[PDB]
């Protein structure tokens, strides 16, 4: 198929579906007619899109963990625990990494080994192997909306199965579930395969079934400048809306400076709505998700709560619709159900301690929002230029030319030239610009902010600072100050 | 330190990349010739690189937890490829979840790994162990 | 002695000293000439006043726990653990409640029972019984400045012993260590006995020995409106300065609305400096302490971390010089050293995750600061009027007439007529004014804010809301919403 | 008529007062005549009030942890004052520190208290227990 930012026809989509469903035998369980009936029977309390609308109307931040294990009954017991003991507002099902690489043979072996071992040898739930039947059992056992959370360049079959399984949100996008998650997948191919996932949600919306889509804001979770993160999220929202998606949660990963983070989330929401309307998508309900610190965690569990709850305070004052919960086991391994419930309880306590409170406007916030919007506009403007008006083609060429460039992305289609580092107040800035298409004024501001850190620390800004910042939070502080 | 060659990679379906960049940086700074095969690396890629570069050691990083599956059998394939006695290190977050570390260490040593490293291991610890094991302290 | 806000003469003070030192045989260990030489040999790193100056210069918030047990060796081991494993910046020694009521016979029995039981049956450290010798052993065993933290209406002997013991800060004041801590002590008597405590610090400063004093901001820890809390703190700072105190930390207890709390601490610091200078005290170094939530805690330890760390975030963004650390055992009992170190580690992690960050100015913050300053000035203006210019006499008459009135204070000299309650955003407001001397404009603003809560909850503002707010945080949220 | 009288207070050198006000409010609203002697109350103040008001029960609140000392001997003094079989309740935060609750409950029952309450006990639990014990439920 050729890549163009244009809604697939019903016939082109159907032709692709018939290929995709053959990729594993559980594809035979997907019956779109029957699945629409099943989805329309789900109570509104268990529909992810409808509950996001409710959260937005009530002005509350909802808490959602990450969670998943190899075996069905154990996975259900885990989610029920996070629901009942944790008090989660939304439920995930985090997909294992073999599924994310379309290696369902390795999922199957991992299922068998997990049964033998009495513990999960997979790092998530193999939703394609468990099929529509398994995914429906998960939904029927819980009392909250369900969302697939993962990191899959080719998620077409996964999406068919989890939506027919009654999961009313799918996370990801053609950039954010490629570059942090793959080494050899072209941007063109992941954009095409995520057009399928978006077009599937578009089909359901055309039948009156409401399903949420969430681009993965945090990307590599490693010092991603807000303007680059937001450029990706706005792009994935626009590409999803063209395929018919109507309920979109754009995301952002905490950088740690409260004003920068709040500026980032507000700019993301404002510019997402602005761009959607500018390109004619006038019926898209946009919400936001704030991810608690996605970099290295401290191993000490009390320090971990320090990160979890400061992150939650930023989300609450930002007015985020959703916050993704980290646990005290983050530095070590997949959390126990107890460690996960501990993270959810601390997060929701912090949210309830801040009910209705919002960061008021300040000159400092207004200035940072202007910086972020101007940097983001530079990137998107250039993408539209490179694509001759087609944002999908423009995204491919932006990655080819380093205009869009994600720190530390394993993808060989990522330029790896732009380099981020924190300024003296901990705001993530651009240390090396690579080919990111900023004006001299925008580059000068980054440099002036970073010079303040050089002056305070008595060393030149450098890649050594970047390394220091990569390790800082795990070592107990936001900014990688000299030892 | 006298120059030696290591193969460095992240095994299996694991895409974590930041630690790989830091390990490359640190072991290069320590004087090693780092042959970095990168993320999403099957066992065969480690062995091909070790053969081509006459590597003294293979450092298998595994962050995503499924390394307990992916790492089984590497020693045997190394023996069959003529790399008898090559140093095999494994580290990162190599099992799913927090576990009793003495149990984990024995499980991977029984797989044929020479050294086995817990979460949060500083690269400097592996560098010192490698210098000792290669007798170039 | 007659109460006047006038520095005691050297002869008056010496006369009182010779009476006070006779109140327990450890008073014989106090030798003022010898103690001055001992204090001057303490390194700057272990002087509380000098380290506060350093924190203010560096713009950092220091973390300090509460801690104390009956036996000397166990207490030293406890403090060392909080220092080394917790990472505390300042050390307390929390005095037991028998000492606070001058019942040193009961302290001694508690020491004996604690030796027999292998655990502390006292809720703190009996500093008067352990004497100068024991208090010096504590100081010499630690590497941080030491402060007596307690709640003692008549603290004269305690202050002599702990200062001669090398502890370079004493918490309290004649209001804040009376009304929350006593039933039958007149305001006049506690003000007189705290003049002694301040005059002792004044003597030491005249010798060149720097000792910090900290009025106890939070009072009853139970919905204390900022303007009433701040009026007490400014009063106690003024009364201390008149006796020669030069280094003062004024305190404030978290109410939970971040903007109200930051406004409160900024108003407290600004008006403390303003009043000190207005009355001619021109060489007083003022710092602030923010107390993490002093009301009832949730029992769940993960929820407790949610309170601890949100509180710390407010303190950090307020620019507090010091934050007092709560532990996850708060709902249950005196923390173990492990639970205490856990609280300190979460607190310091949060502080380091927010390094250098301050709440920027906003219209919302500016408005709340103006409200708090105006309310506080109403109270202080009336106190000066009642005292015909003498603030100490005016404080006595203010309590007699309900001008100053502390919510839920056990003192029979507290009117108990003013009633606080939260508004719809969680800000503590005045529900019933009693005799607090507010203008109609100030009263009407309180009423308008509270009406928003009536409208949102669908019930009239009432004492039932007060009860709900008293229980709310222990039940998982800031505002006592209807069930 | 049969309006029942309780003496309510906080024992020893304890100045915590908010729970006392709430307990007074709750038990008054439940129909009891609450004789509130307040904070910082020695044992003898509970007994003098129980005698003068012919109280049916004494509710001892102890928040500050030293109640394990203060509370010993109240039952015996009640017997010696002619208050045999008066109901004695104790609650709050009655020992120093988090402890195994069944051990704490037994220690205070061994001192002569009829009912013993853990931290965070709602007033409604004590009201229901008291109505049951006084056969007025
Ligand atoms: C950032 C991050 C991400 C980013 C990574 C971006 C990228 N492509 O690099 C994103 C968000 C995309 C990501 C994704 C996922 N992640 Co992740 N990630 C992390 C995180 C937060 C920090 C990792 C990091 O970069 N640290 C900084 C670098 C410098 O340190 P490092 O990677 O730990 O490596 C150092 C040390 O381990 C040591 N070391 C490492 N290997 C070796 C080898 C030897 C021989 C030696 C001596 C030393 C050594 O030295 C390295 C250099 O300092 C960790 C948790 C944490 N540590 O707090 C989770 C973590 C690694 N992720 C985890 C998981 C499960 C996932 C997924 C696999 C989810 C899934 N179910 O599929 C996916 C990846 C999909 C896939 N195909 O693998 C788990 C692993 C669980 C387990 N083992 O039990 C962790 C531990 C989180 C958790 N507690 O659950 N993640
Ligand atoms: C607010 C508070 C303060 C305020 C109190 C102001 C005042 N005068 O009232 C201030 C800051 C002044 C204060 C001071 C101190 N406090 Co204090 N305080 C608290 C706190 C945070 C909440 C108490 C409260 O008001 N709760 C709300 C009310 C409504 O509930 P409540 O008091 O718990 O009572 C309810 C239940 O217990 C139950 N209940 C209580 N008694 C009874 C009796 C019966 C028969 C029944 C059926 C039910 C029942 O019903 C009550 C009503 O709902 C608690 C910890 C917590 N709970 O989170 C510590 C706490 C009680 N304090 C404690 C201590 C030690 C102190 C001091 C004694 C310090 C010292 N070392 O001297 C001093 C007091 C000095 C003195 N002479 O006693 C400790 C006790 C430790 C222990 N037992 O192991 C606690 C538990 C904190 C801790 N974890 O260390 N405190
Ligand atoms: C860097 C992966 C992030 O996603 C989380 N995550 C990935 N897989 C799971 C999983 N299976 N269960 C719970 N949390 C998970 C992980 O804890 C870390 O925060
Ligand atoms: C309402 C008393 C407050 O002071 C604290 N506190 C009082 N005495 C001690 C003590 N001896 N050790 C540790 N913390 C103490 C208590 O935990 C609570 O936060």
Residue numbers in the entry:
A (entry chain B), C (entry chain D): 1 to 483
B (entry chain A), D (entry chain C): 1 to 137
Sentences from the paper on this structure:
We describe here the high‐resolution crystal structures of GM from Clostridium cochlearium, reconstituted with AdoMeCbl and AdoEtCbl and the pseudo‐substrate (S,S)‐tartrate. As previously observed, GM forms a hetero‐tetramer consisting of two copies of the larger ϵ‐subunit (an (αβ)8 TIM‐barrel) and the smaller B12‐binding σ‐subunit, showing a typical Rossman fold. The ϵ‐subunit harbours the substrate‐binding site comprising three arginine residues (the “arginine claw”) that undergo strong polar binding interactions with the carboxylate groups of an (S,S)‐tartrate ion. The process catalysed by GM [12a] assigns the enzyme‐generated Ado‐radical the specific function of abstracting (in the direction from (S)‐glutamate to (2S,3S)‐3‐methylaspartate) the pro‐S H‐atom from the 4‐position of (S)‐glutamate, furnishing 5′‐deoxyadenosine and a 4‐glutamyl radical.
We have set out to test this AdoCbl‐activation hypothesis with two “stretched” AdoCbl‐homologues, designed and synthesised as potential structural mimics of “activated” AdoCbl, provisionally named “homocoenzyme B12” (AdoMeCbl) and “bis‐homocoenzyme B12” (AdoEtCbl). AdoMeCbl and AdoEtCbl are bound in a base‐off/His‐on form, with distances between cobalt and the coordinating histidine imidazole of 2.21 Å and 2.17 Å, respectively, similar to GM‐bound AdoCbl (2.22 Å) and free AdoMeCbl (2.19 Å). In both new structures, the electron density for the “stretched” AdoCbl‐homologues indicated an intact bond between the cobalt ion and the terminal carbons C6′ or C7′ of the 5′‐methyl‐ or 5′‐ethyl‐adenosyl ligands of AdoMeCbl and AdoEtCbl, respectively. The refined Co−C bond lengths at 2.07 Å or 1.98 Å for the bound AdoMeCbl and AdoEtCbl, respectively, were somewhat longer or slightly shorter than the 2.00 Å observed in the crystal structures of AdoCbl and AdoMeCbl, [25a] but in stark contrast to distances of >3.2 Å observed between cobalt and C5′ of the adenosyl ligand in GM reconstituted with AdoCbl. The distances from Co to C5′ of the Ado moieties of the bound AdoMeCbl and AdoEtCbl were 3.2 Å and 4.2 Å, strikingly comparable to the distances between the Co‐atom and C5′ in the two observed structures of “activated” AdoCbl in the crystal structure of GM reconstituted with AdoCbl. In GM‐AdoMeCbl, the cobalt‐bound AdoMe‐ligand fills the adenosine binding cavity with little strain, and its Co−C bond remains intact. However, in GM‐AdoMeCbl, the corresponding ribose unit of AdoMeCbl exhibits a 2T3 (2,3‐twist) conformation, similar to the particular 2E (C2′‐endo) ra‐conf in GM‐AdoCbl. Hence, AdoMeCbl is bound to GM with not only an intact Co−C bond but also exhibits the typical hallmarks of a rather unstrained ribose moiety. The experimental geometric parameters reflect only a minor “pull” in the case of AdoMeCbl and an opposite small “squeeze” in AdoEtCbl.
